[PDB]
Design a protein around this ligand. Sequence first.
Ligand code: P9T
Ligand code: ZN
Ligand code: ZN
Length: 229
Amino acid sequence: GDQRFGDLVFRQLAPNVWQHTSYLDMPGFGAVASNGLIVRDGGRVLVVDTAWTDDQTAQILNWIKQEINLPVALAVVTHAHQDKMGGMDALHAAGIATYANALSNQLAPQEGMVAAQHSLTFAANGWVEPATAPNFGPLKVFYPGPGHTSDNITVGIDGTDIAFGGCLIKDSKAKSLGNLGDADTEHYAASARAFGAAFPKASMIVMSHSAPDSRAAITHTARMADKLR
Ligand SMILES: O=c1cc(CP(=O)(O)O)c2c(F)cc(F)cc2o1
Ligand SMILES: [Zn+2]
Ligand SMILES: [Zn+2]
């Protein structure tokens, strides 16, 4: 199922959905995989998250050209850390319109990231303000509250059983919540559960650092986060 393409890995999840995976050495710790998504919506392609680097992100675009061969209409990135925004310049060089949580764009410079071109804003209940996410097709963007970071956002794919938790969600057998350096430990559990409640039909949960899992990823992540309080 997995397709090795250079130093990246691509896995089809649904007729119109693929997971992209890229790797970065975290010195002394290891080569960390990070996942995002590629969605075909009719005659265009939508991307969720960059790879870690510009070069890797250009390779995602090369894979899209070879395997889908339709324009990439936009990309949305799910918080201001390198695994999700490190390739912003490659998207801009390719002429792709880019979107992030307003807070992600504000944080980008201090995090060493390049901001996206457009800012998403969110209603009090967490759903994106639709005028800020034009032409998102089946992508349904939800801010679940602070968790892995204060700016973390999540994405459901309408018409599929897939929802993407990014770095908020860990798999159903994960031993830890990963990098909590920028986390909101008090609100993490509620934010994880809010993600699950926003996408009740999603039976396939996609996340940054593990293979797609069942909804037990959500319950297990929230149960682990209960202990942080
Ligand atoms: O494996 C990692 C992955 C990340 C990126 P993320 O948190 O978005 O997964 C990371 C980071 F951003 C800061 C850090 F200090 C250690 C880290 O270690
Ligand atoms: Zn992160
Ligand atoms: Zn992460």
